[PDB]
Amino acid sequence: KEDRILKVWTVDPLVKVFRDSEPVALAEVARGERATLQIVIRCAKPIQELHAKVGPLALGSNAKQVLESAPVRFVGYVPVDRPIPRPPKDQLRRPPADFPDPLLEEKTIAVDENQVQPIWVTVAVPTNTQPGLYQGSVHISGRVDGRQITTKVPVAIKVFDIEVGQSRLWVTNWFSMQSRHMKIAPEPDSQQYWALLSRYARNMSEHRQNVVLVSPLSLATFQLDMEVDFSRFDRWVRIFIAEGVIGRIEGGHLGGRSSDWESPFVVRIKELREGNIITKSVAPTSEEANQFYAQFLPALVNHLRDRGWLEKYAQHLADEPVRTNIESYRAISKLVRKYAPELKIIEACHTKDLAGAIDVWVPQLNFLHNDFEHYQKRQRAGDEVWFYTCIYPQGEYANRFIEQPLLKTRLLHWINYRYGMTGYLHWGYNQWGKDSPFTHTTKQHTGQQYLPAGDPWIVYPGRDGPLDSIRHEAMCDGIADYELLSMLGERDPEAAKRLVNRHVLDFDRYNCNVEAFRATRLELLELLS
């Protein structure tokens, strides 16, 4: 006894806890938000069978009014072996190091001696929850050198009388339908395939994603005697509607680069060749491109209109146009404008010189900063402007890299509010490679640069569906923050400016002080309640 005492403390969930962190639970939320509590343990001896149970979280005026807690999850660690090449000053530690990120879904875990272990508690608070102060405890148990150890940790959730429903922010995370590294491996069109697709869709809507990228080329079949069959595309759309994502439908890219970074764009077509439908890439000004798109685009518009989906849809042309391939990009736009004038066009862009060619602009964050007057004008002209991050920007800009403070993920959506950008895009929902994402955090193809840890995936492969990361949680919370700030700004625009300006000081400069952030959140909640 003494070496068996369990050290327990509570840490703000915006603070990343490392295996060697030193010791230091209340959450404050609107109805409609998710409350997170992070409870951290350490023991001088190994622990077997660590388990936590959330007791009833009850209203003091009425023990009958209880919040429903999700199953408890354990914070998992991943080896970040190589760093962001241009890191921020506030980089949490220098690689190589083990960082907290995946939220594991295990009933029990082992802890090695002297290793700090976070326990992550999520309480989703429905909009119809009665406001007030909910209290209870988390019962932690396990076995240390024979003996059963146990402790209860007091926790409290204050539920403010303000309702956050759907966030008006548009959010897309590009998703690949794949079961790599899972304990299941469904084939396409199997029941389990569609069940997994549903589980992914639910995970996305539970994290306030309300846009999904679906390809009308890849998920259609063609007969070319043209007849287009959209039945697989439709199954996807109905799943994403039913699980509460759609929202909007983001049509997959029609084309891409012919070769290298500055090469011209080509567009995919379908052709009948020797009895088979083949796909090939052609110049957008070609007769082959004109013949295909003159039939495919009207078929797509008719289909969407007939299904009541046309006003929810926007079509991608080709990703990340730059100044040197602008002509071929615009030639793709001309095809769409000609055969499908009713279709809205969306693009993740670098070049700004696309007025009339696209309707939903998605500049990379640093390009938005640099070309801000351009993008404000496009909004005045009636276009939508969102933004993205990826491998870039690095430096001091906000992003969702594992090396960054977790507030840099959450404050992405404060950048949306401050600057009036009405959506956010990211390529990297679940782009796992052939190596495990748990043990190989810096994805890399041979002869090209590695991706910083955090960039290609924000969820991890569980046994039969996605596991969240702590960054997925922070992203969801930021999307709810944007809705709160938007509700405030309708009543009191000056108070919403003051609050956002506390944390978003410029495009590339923030206040990530977690205590300051909590005091801002509380003022927001108090002003709105």
Numbering used by the authors: 27 to 50, 55 to 255, 260 to 563
Quote the original article.
Beta-N-acetylgalactosaminidases (β-NGAs) hydrolyze the different β-GalNAc linkages of various glycans to modulate the length, combination, and abundance of glycans. Despite low sequence similarity, the crystal structures of these enzymes demonstrate that all enzymes share a prototype structure and have diversified their substrate specificities (oligosaccharide-releasing, oligosaccharide/monosaccharide-releasing, and monosaccharide-releasing) through the accumulation of mutations and insertional amino acid sequences. The overall structure of these enzymes is similar to that of CpNga123 and BvGH123, which consist of a β-sandwich domain at the N-terminus and a (β/α)8-barrel domain encompassing the catalytic region. Among Groups 1–4 and GH123, the DE motif is located at the same position, suggesting that these enzymes adopt the substrate-assisted catalysis reported for GH123 MR-β-NGAs.
We used deep-sea metagenomic sequences to discover a β-NGA, NgaDssm, which is the β-NGA to possess dual OR/MR-type-β-NGA activity and low sequence similarity to known MR-β-NGAs. Assays using various pNP-substrates revealed that NgaDssm was active on GalNAc-β-pNP but not on GlcNAc-β-pNP or GalNAc-α-pNP, indicating that the enzyme possessed exo-β-NGA but not exo-β-HEX activity. Furthermore, the enzyme hydrolyzed Galβ1-3GalNAc-β-pNP but not Gal-β-pNP, demonstrating a oligosaccharide (including disaccharide)-releasing (OR)-β-NGA activity in addition to monosaccharide-releasing (MR)-type (exo-type) activity. These findings suggest that NgaDssm is an OR/MR-β-NGA. The active site of the OR/MR-type NgaDssm from Group 3 has a cleft structure that enables passage to the −2 subsites, as in NgaCa, but it also possesses two additional β-hairpins from the second and third β-sheets of the (β/α)8 barrel domain (purple). The structure of NgaDssm (Group 3) bore a striking resemblance to that of NgaLy and NgaP2 (Group 4) (root-mean-square distance of Cα atoms [rmsd] = 1.5–2.3 Å), while the structures of NgaLy and NgaP2 are identical (rmsd = 1.0 Å). The increased number of residues could potentially reinforce substrate recognition in Group 4 and GH123 enzymes. Additional structural analyses (comparison of crystal structure with AlphaFold2 predicted structure of NgaCa, comparison of apo1-form and apo2-form of NgaCa, and comparison of GalNAc-thiazoline-bond form and GlcNAc-thiazoline-/apo-form of NgaAt, NgaDssm, and NgaP2) data are illustrated in Supplementary Fig. 13. The anomeric hydrogen signal of Galβ-1-3GalNAcβ-pNP (between the GalNAc and pNP moieties) disappeared within 1 min for NgaDssm and 10 min for NgaCa and Galβ-1-3GalNAcβ appeared, while Galβ-1-3GalNAcα anomeric signals appeared after 10 and 30 min, respectively, due to mutarotation. These results indicate that NgaDssm and NgaCa are anomer-retaining enzymes, similar to GH123 enzymes.
